[PDB]
Amino acid sequence: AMELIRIAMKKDLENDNSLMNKWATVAGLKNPNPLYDFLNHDGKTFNEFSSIVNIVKSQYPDREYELMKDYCLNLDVKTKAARSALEYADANMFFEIEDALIDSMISCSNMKSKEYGKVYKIHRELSKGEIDVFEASANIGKQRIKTAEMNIFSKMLLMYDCLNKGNFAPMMLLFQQIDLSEIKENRYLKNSFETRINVLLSNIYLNENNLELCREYAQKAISSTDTQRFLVFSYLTIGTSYIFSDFNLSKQNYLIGLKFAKGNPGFEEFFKRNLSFLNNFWNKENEWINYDSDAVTDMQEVIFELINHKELSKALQLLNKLEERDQNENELGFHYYLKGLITNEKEAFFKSVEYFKASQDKLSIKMPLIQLEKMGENPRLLKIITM
Amino acid sequence: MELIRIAMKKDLENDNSLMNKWATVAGLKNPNPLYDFLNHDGKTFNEFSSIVNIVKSQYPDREYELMKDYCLNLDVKTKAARSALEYADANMFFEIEDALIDSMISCSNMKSKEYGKVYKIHRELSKGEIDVFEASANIGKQRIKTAEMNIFSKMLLMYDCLNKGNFAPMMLLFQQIDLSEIKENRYLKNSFETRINVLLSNIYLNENNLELCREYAQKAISSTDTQRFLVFSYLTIGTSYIFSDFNLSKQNYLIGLKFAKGNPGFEEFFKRNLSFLNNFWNKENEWINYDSDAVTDMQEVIFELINHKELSKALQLLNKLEERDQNENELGFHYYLKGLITNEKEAFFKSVEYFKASQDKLSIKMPLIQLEKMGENPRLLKIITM
């Protein structure tokens, strides 16, 4: 038993024989034989990578990272299981596991593993902004892809870049070229890619303002997965889809997401900030404000709370202080929106609309737009701006 | 034996002084390369401009025939064949270009093979036979060595970005281009520079930076005598002035129209733009096409009736047009005309929506100006154009 997971399992089985049939059903097996094999013989893998992930999530939930790191670094890089490990690591944003698997798969002599390694490396580089979308497609081309799996993943990696540049027409063009039924042997990879695609589509529809479609895609993703990363982003999207229409559903979706985020500080932050904004926008008591942070976004949330409490003079002073510092366009939109709530000047709301339009934020633009309608501006013309 | 060499030998027999005339027009300090070109099969000039300039000067009416024949018998492995390929693509001489492409991918010379493969990707992307992602993937597959094709592969992607109206990735590719890396091929460097100035010109025309637009179009005009680039540069300058200065718009279109002489297709762009310009500024219009069955021309007829307060005839011809199939840009214009006839705000609002849906940041100004006249808030109208 070289791998940490095999050591723990043999140990726990010595104390409790009934675990064997428990772990068999949790892994999806009709019969426990592959599990006897896994425990006894070095290098014996399950046919599907979900078998081991499920056993680890169930029996050692607190120890997932340590156990999976050790298990992945000990896999034969030439196998289906190592190729599945690479997807698992990237999905969970376990970049240390992933980068080690990538380097050793590019080295190996197996054609399949080499190609997956080279393609995931392109995805890593594009994510980090070390290359742009055109260098990335050029590298995809250089590689002369053979597998149906990497044919699909090369399209998805380009979609990720298109998503974070807010450029949706080319995303849909790439989506159209994907056919998941061509993944014939690797059911773990097919299911994981399907989860990725449902999340991506969810974010598309959220920006194109089809709120119903957005929620349906986010739910499809939630149903298909137990990966923390995808659960977190799906609930974040659902929360956001409700901001303007239903305080209570927005909040509860953020709280469910926050619970799934437990023990990842970075994921937890997204929910705290969104909750802070939500509670301010709907004039509710706000437990989420960060009074210590000197990041612009957080300091704006403190101004917004002063405004809800009719402390207009203090809000104005902190807002003038912020004007001194460098702000991008999205922050300036928010800045002028707050100024408008204090002073009731139409000009501030107009500037706010301009800044949000210039920064390509199709969500926050609704805030000064709602105010301008309240001040008697023409609804028919306001609607045209959001198109 | 090339037709151009036959004509030149013939004209030289009658006039010995042509030799020194053709030498200076070709940019050579000394006539030797020209004696060589006439006498020995396969001898090329160092620069492709040499032969283009001789042909433009001595046989202006025969450019297409002479250049077609010359290019089809070139040594495909040479600098001159690589320059021919640029010349043909710039002029949209697709016959010449496709023949050079096929025979350059055949040859064993690494440089010519790479140019051929890269121009072929440009041709395929233009025709919509592939999308922008297949095109970059093919660029990658090729393993490009030359600095020339490194640059041109970026420009071919710019062309596709332009036709899809997505300008941010164009600018990203523009920033990666450095023309001083083209060390040896002066003809190609100058031609690529022309292409880039035209592309930037059209960017800024859509992003409403009108002064930048004109400056780039002028830079292109200064650098070129290719009729295609002259025509599109003047068309762009004309268009940049539509809303702000009738007279400069008109004069820029008339200079463009003169450069278009003897290409009916190019001439049409100017006639239609002139027709629109005169209608928009309520001037007597000599440019109307009463015979054309194109939507855009039939709209110009309606617009003229409206300027003459012939409202009931305009209404009848407008109802006729509504029956027929129209894209969004035409529908914008359709509802604008309806609004001028009926004075309904609804028609102007729809007009704005159709122009916004069709990504036309210019024509949208027309119903916007009307809405301001009807008392809608100018401050909010300005945001819709931005």
Author numbering:
A (entry chain A): 0 to 386
B (entry chain B): 1 to 386
Paper text:
The arbitrium system is employed by phages of the SPbeta family to communicate with their progeny during infection to decide either to follow the lytic or the lysogenic cycle. In this study, we deepen our understanding of the system by solving the structure of an additional AimR that shows chimerical characteristics with the SPβ receptor.
AimRKat apo crystals diffract to 2.4 Å and belong to space group P212121 showing two molecules in the asymmetric unit (ASU). Both protomers are almost identical with an average RMSD (root mean square deviation of Cα carbon coordinates superimposition) of 0.7 Å. The two protomers form a dimer in the crystal, an oligomeric organisation confirmed in solution by size-exclusion chromatography with multi-angle light scattering (SEC-MALS). AimRKat, AimRSPβ-I and AimRPhi structures show dimers with large contact interfaces spanning more than 1420 Å2 in AimRKat. Further, this structural comparison also confirms that AimRKat in its apo state exists in a DNA-binding competent conformation, similar to the DNA-bound AimRSPβ structure (RMSD of only 0.87 Å for the comparison of both dimers).
